[PDB]
Amino acid sequence: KNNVPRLKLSYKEMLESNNVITFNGLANSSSYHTFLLDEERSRLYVGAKDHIFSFNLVNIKDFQKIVWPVSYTRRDECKWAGKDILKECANFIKVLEAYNQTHLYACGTGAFHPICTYIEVGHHPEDNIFKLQDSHFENGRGKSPYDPKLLTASLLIDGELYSGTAADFMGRDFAIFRTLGHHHPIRTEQHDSRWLNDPRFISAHLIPESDNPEDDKVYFFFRENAIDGEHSGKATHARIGQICKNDFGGHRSLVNKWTTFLKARLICSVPGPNGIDTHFDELQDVFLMNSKDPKNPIVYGVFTTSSNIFKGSAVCMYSMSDVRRVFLGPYAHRDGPNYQWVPYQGRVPYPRPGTCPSKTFGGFDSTKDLPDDVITFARSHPAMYNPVFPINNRPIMIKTDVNYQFTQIVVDRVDAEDGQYDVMFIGTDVGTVLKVVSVPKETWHDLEEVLLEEMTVFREPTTISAMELSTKQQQLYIGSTAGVAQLPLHRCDIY
Amino acid sequence: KNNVPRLKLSYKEMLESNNVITFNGLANSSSYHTFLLDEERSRLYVGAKDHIFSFNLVNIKDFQKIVWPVSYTRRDECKWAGKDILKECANFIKVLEAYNQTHLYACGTGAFHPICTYIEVGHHPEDNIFKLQDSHFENGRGKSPYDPKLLTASLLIDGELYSGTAADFMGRDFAIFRTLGHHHPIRTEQHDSRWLNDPRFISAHLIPESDNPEDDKVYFFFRENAIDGEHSGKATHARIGQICKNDFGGHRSLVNKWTTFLKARLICSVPGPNGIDTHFDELQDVFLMNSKDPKNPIVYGVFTTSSNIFKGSAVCMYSMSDVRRVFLGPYAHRDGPNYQWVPYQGRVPYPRPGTCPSKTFGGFDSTKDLPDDVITFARSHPAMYNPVFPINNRPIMIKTDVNYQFTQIVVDRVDAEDGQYDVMFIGTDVGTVLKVVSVLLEEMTVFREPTTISAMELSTKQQQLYIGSTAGVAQLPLHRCDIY
Ligand SMILES: CC(=O)N[C@@H]1[C@@H](O)[C@H](O)[C@@H](CO)O[C@H]1O
Ligand SMILES: CC(=O)N[C@@H]1[C@@H](O)[C@H](O)[C@@H](CO)O[C@H]1O
Ligand SMILES: CC(=O)N[C@@H]1[C@@H](O)[C@H](O)[C@@H](CO)O[C@H]1O
Structure with a gap:
């Protein structure tokens, strides 16, 4: 108490x-924000400013450092852009995930010129190899932002990179990308408010839907500016967006653009007396509590107040069964620009847009072989109407009075x-x-913190x-x- | 600082x-909430549970009282109605206002059957009279709520009673009424969330506009539930409404109903960094500072946060020049429930809705003579699109750390x-x-x-x-x- x-x-x-x-x-150096934990190699990688580290996760005083700054030429180019020589014109590593069984994939701001490369770690961890593969350098656009102030929710699986950030120099073309691999990189519609509205990414997870990998979905968590009317009401919306790992874009429309992309508001509020709730929209971080059932990882979320005068924090919990219900619920639909958002009620393209291509129902092989009505929809219906409420409709922790x-x-x-x-x-x-x-103090509902x-x-x-x-x-x-x-x-x- | x-x-x-x-x-007794300060008589009247006191402004230790508790029969019909005999089946006075030069007007919760009566206090504050003119007894429908938990905003001027409360036993029919004074009571439209939507009243004030008594308007202050699509997001909207003192409704349609009601939102917020403002929508009280010009009293307001978790209070000042700018602006407008609110770009009928009839400019000297097109409008256009912001677009004071x-x-x-x-x-x-x-x-x-x-x-x-x-x-x- x-x-x-x-x-x-x-x-x-x-x-x-x-x-x-x-x-x-x-x-x-600075900005030691990018962490890549590696239990097997028993090391803790941390990509920072002009550098990338390989700490010994038993005593981080023992380590290795790959000095990866940028060329004098590049530095100057950033300078000429009228940017901050020390705060901006540097290579801030923003991405650091696993790739080959012997190499890591790393991306960073190459002084407002995103560049990536590989970090050979080797086969055997016995011989701590922390070599940087120079001279290569791949395009960083869509993988690491231009601006160091922006973060990146990265997820690298089966040799493909999934990352949500700002893709342009101007830092205003935020999008969820899928780079590397065989196919042409996949992207979200650009300059489309209904898809993404000045968001900020937090994380991305590979969550299996069944024993059939064919049904694997990638969830991205992020916050963004709400949208409803032209009324005095700016606001934030924590959100969760789902996308099919086996999505390859449209055929005669969303060419190389996600077809199974949908989002829902993640609400983290505390019910009130007069019926008006207190909300913690600013989603800051997210951790998945891996249950024995990989198909149902518990989602913990750290939220914050939007108000500048009412600083506060909350820790909400969500069950995938809920997000899935929402994603199978009504699509948010609006007729005109001056229309109230309403739950779409009338003919939904088959297969249900958002659903991954199945070789069992509909038979449609690959997204690229889907009807036009199932591409037109989703294209203008990225958002679900109903929001996903936290388990029990309330956070399991709240801190207000604190500083x-x-x-x-x-x-x-x-x-x-x-x-x-x-x-x-x-x-x-x-x-x-x-x-x-x-x-749970005697009973779920009245719990002790x-x-x-x-x-x-x-x-x-x-x-x-x-x-x-x-x-x-x-x-x-x-x-x-x-x-x-x-x-x-x-x-x-x-x- | x-x-x-x-x-x-x-x-x-x-x-x-x-x-x-x-x-x-x-x-x-209890609930000593209905105050009525009389400088001339140098006393302070007060309405309460089954009682109406009269305190001396020099020493409230010296006072006279009146016992008005409701008869047995009534106390019983309230009990069978399934109410709380202790905290409900009593006469809680909710309205104390001067009437004649010799009487006060009073109304209370008639144990869920509101009643009103006069209170003699003579011409000379020297004789200090306080006789409760019993007998007769008028009803208080639309003058006082039935439920003691509900407030009422009153204002009695020129022999007329203007008040905003619940005109019903079930406390769901909130309205703004004008009872007493020569003409049939006039009220707002019943069951129409556009007009009023589960509001809580605070006060009514008379504020002239021009040097012509006919342009006089009565302003009410209150707080109600916002309306913005089936979509959720419950919120509170502090508001201020106007009404012409000489409005007596139309001939047919809006018969015995305000043809001049207009209301606008009162904003009291604090600009934020990321463009997000902190609002205090729960109006709690209002005080008008009589400035040099009787057409421009400064409006002070006490607002609180709707959030049950974060406690916070603010005070906000508003000028009647701003309020009037909003009332002379775009009315709020909807094509239906599934549409977004939008400033009315259409052609506003003439005379302009909300405009007091006048024996001068206007061409009309009566509200009942208004044409159908204006009455039709108004009927569906009681709200304004632009909210009235507070002087400097900031509140004067703020308290949030406070408990x-x-x-x-x-x-x-x-x-x-x-x-x-x-x-x-x-x-x-x-x-x-x-x-x-x-x-x-x-x-x-x-x-x-x-x-x-x-x-x-x-x-x-x-x-x-x-x-x-x-x-x-x-x-x-x-x-x-x-x-x-
Ligand atoms: C250019 C650069 O920043 N890298 C240097 C690195 O060569 C040196 O071994 C180390 C020693 O502290 O300091 C780093 O800053
Ligand atoms: C050992 C292995 O098969 N993994 C490959 C590595 O051989 C290759 O050099 C690298 C690209 O440089 O990509 C890794 O996935
Ligand atoms: C409820 C009621 O009938 N009113 C009585 C009143 O008769 C009496 O004069 C007064 C002073 O003790 O106390 C009140 O409780």
């Missing part, structure tokens, strides 16, 4: 108890000799980490940008421009 | 300094050595009054126990402030510079 940490600690105390291994980062806001989250399923509890590790914009448990620890993990206060949980090292890794930080999950002999 | 009070005295500290005179109220919320307000115009300064005495839902000057002087508790301040009057001819609540009334001096 309290909101005070039963165990508070500062970077100081943490350092005087063996609970923090700080990497202060090189003097000629900081949540920025990252990860959770471990710890089995206790009296049941299992989902322990959340929430990162703050202040540089502190909170460990909380939401045990327990703040176990509040540990600062950076000499100076900074915004936490990345968190990676290791269930093989039992170590948490925080990231920021100030550098990376490592700490143990527990500390049971200090309570 | 601060948030801490220079003078934070508690009730104990206020009582131990003659800073507050307390009336713990009667045991058989309470404003509930009442009054302001005094005090002449000093530097110039005139407007001091705002803000009430609180936790028994407390904040004194504020602009460009927090003191935070004083005024009740032994915490409650909601629901009434607040200011007597300049006595330099005192009176606060209302269910606990009782509280007297307090505007300054007491000694404590400083």
